[PDB]
C-alpha cells in the first residue's frame, strides 16, 4: 500500500505545516502537525479542558464506532520548546492520504499548554520519530509509520516541504518526479529515538565549504535550523548589523538586509538553503528588526535540522531494518 497527503504552512512564515488526517468511523478529519522529532499521535478532543480549546477541531471518540478506550493507558509529553500535553488513549482507525492503519493509538488530550491552545490551526501532532520515544504508559505504543510499515510497498516515508507553499508527505514510495539529480543517503543512529545523522559540513553564501561533522536530527516539527554556535556566528557575521539579542531570544538582523544562502553537506552532496528561507520577519509587528532562521543549538543539547533546512530538500526517511536518511535537491 501507499499514502500521499498534502501538507500546508499554517501561516505566512512557514512556522509549521498541517496535514489532514482521518480518524474514526465515520471519519473525523483533523489537521495534524507531522513531527519526525516525536513519536506520539495526540489530538485535541472532546476530553480536552474546555478553556484550553480555542478554535481547534476536536476528536470525539464517542461518535466513532471503531474507537475503543485503551484501558489504563495515559500519556504525557513535553517538547523542546517548553510546550506540553497529556491525557488518555483510544485505539481507532487512522488514515493519511489514502493509507489506513487499524488499531492506531490515538492519544486524547485532557490538558494542553498555552502554546497549543493559542494555535487554532493545529489540531494535534502525528509523531514520526522512532516508537521508543512514545510516551504511553504502562504499554508503549507504535507510531502510525511503524504500524503501517509492513503493509507499505517500501518501508519509507518522504517529506517534501514547501517554501511559502504546500508540499507533500508520501508513505511507501519515492516519487522520482519530486526531486532533481540523485538522492544521497546517509547513516542514521536510532540510539536517542530520533532520525539522527551527521552532516559533512557547511558553507555560507558563496564561501568555501568547511568540512566538519555536525551530528543532528531531521525534525519536521521544529521550525528553524539549530546549529553549533561557531557555525551560526560564521553565518550571521556575513549580514551587516546582525546580532544575537538576549532579549529577543536569538539572532536578529536588519529587515533591510539581503540574506546569504547556507549550504549543508550530505556525504559528498550539498543542499543549498536560499537566503529568503532564513528570514522569519519582524520580531514584532512593524519592527525593522527581523528574526533569523538559523539559530544556535547551545543549551538545546542537540543540533536540529528543522523546517528551514528540510524544506530545501526532498527528504527520504528510510525505515528499513537499518534505517537511513536520503536528501535530494528539488
Swiss-Prot record:
Keywords: Aspartyl protease, Disulfide bond, Hydrolase, Protease, Signal, Zymogen
Gene Ontology biological-process entries: proteolysis
Domain Peptidase A1: start-end pairs: 17-328
Entry's Gene Ontology molecular function annotations: aspartic-type endopeptidase activity
Active site per the UniProt annotation: 35, 199
EC number: 3.4.23.22
Reaction(s) catalysed by this chain's protein: Hydrolysis of proteins with specificity similar to that of pepsin A, prefers hydrophobic residues at P1 and P1', but does not cleave 14-Ala-|-Leu-15 in the B chain of insulin or Z-Glu-Tyr. Clots milk
Positions of disulphide bridges: 255-290
Family recorded in the similarity comment: Belongs to the peptidase A1 family.
Protein name per its UniProtKB record: Endothiapepsin
Native source organism of the sequence: Cryphonectria parasitica (Chestnut blight fungus)
Amino acid at each position: 500500500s501507499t499514502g500521499s497527503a498534502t501538507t500546508t504552512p499554517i501561516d505566512s512564515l512557514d512556522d509549521a505545516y498541517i496535514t489532514p488526517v482521518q480518524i474514526g468511523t465515520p471519519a473525523q478529519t483533523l489537521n495534524l502537525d507531522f513531527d519526525t522529532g516525536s513519536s506520539d499521535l495526540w489530538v485535541f478532543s472532546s476530553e480536552t479542558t474546555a478553556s484550553e480549546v480555542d478554535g481547534q477541531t476536536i476528536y470525539t471518540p464517542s461518535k466513532s464506532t471503531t474507537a475503543k478506550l485503551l484501558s489504563g493507558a495515559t500519556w504525557s509529553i513535553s517538547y523542546g520548546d517548553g510546550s506540553s500535553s497529556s491525557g488518555d488513549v483510544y485505539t481507532d482507525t487512522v488514515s493519511v492520504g489514502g493509507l489506513t492503519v487499524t488499531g492506531q493509538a490515538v492519544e486524547s488530550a485532557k490538558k494542553v499548554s498555552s502554546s497549543f491552545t493559542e494555535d487554532s490551526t493545529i489540531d494535534g501532532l502525528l509523531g514520526l520519530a522512532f516508537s521508543t520515544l512514545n510516551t504511553v504508559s504502562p504499554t508503549q505504543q507504535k507510531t502510525f509509520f511503524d504500524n503501517a510499515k509492513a503493509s507499505l510497498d517500501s518501508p519509507v516515508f518522504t517529506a517534501d516541504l514547501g517554501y511559502h507553499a504546500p508540499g507533500t508527505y508520501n508513505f511507501g514510495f519515492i516519487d522520482t518526479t519530486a526531486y532533481t539529480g540523485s538522492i544521497t543517503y546517509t547513516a542514521v543512529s536510532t540510539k536517542q529515538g530520533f532520525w539522527e545523522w551527521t552532516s559533512t559540513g557547511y558553507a555560507v553564501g558563496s564561501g568555501t565549504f568547511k568540512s566538519t561533522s555536525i551530528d543532528g536530527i531531521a525534525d519536521t516539527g521544529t521550525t528553524l535550523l539549530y546549529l553549533p554556535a561557531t557555525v551560526v556566528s560564521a553565518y550571521w557575521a556575513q549580514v551587516s548589523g546582525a546580532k544575537s539579542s538576549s532579549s529577543v531570544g536569538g539572532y536578529v538582523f536588519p529587515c533591510s538586509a539581503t540574506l546569504p544562502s547556507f549550504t549543508f553537506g550530505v556525504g559528498s552532496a550539498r543542499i543549498v538553503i536560499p537566503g529568503d528561507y532564513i528570514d522569519f520577519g519582524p520580531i514584532s509587528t512593524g519592527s525593522s528588526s527581523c528574526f533569523g532562521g538559523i539559530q544556535s543549538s547551545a543549551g538545546i543539547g542537540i543540533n536540529i535540522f528543522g523546517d528551514v533546512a528540510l524544506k530545501a530538500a526532498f527528504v527520504v526517511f528510510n525505515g528499513a531494518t537499518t534505517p537511513t536518511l536520503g536528501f535530494a535537491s528539488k
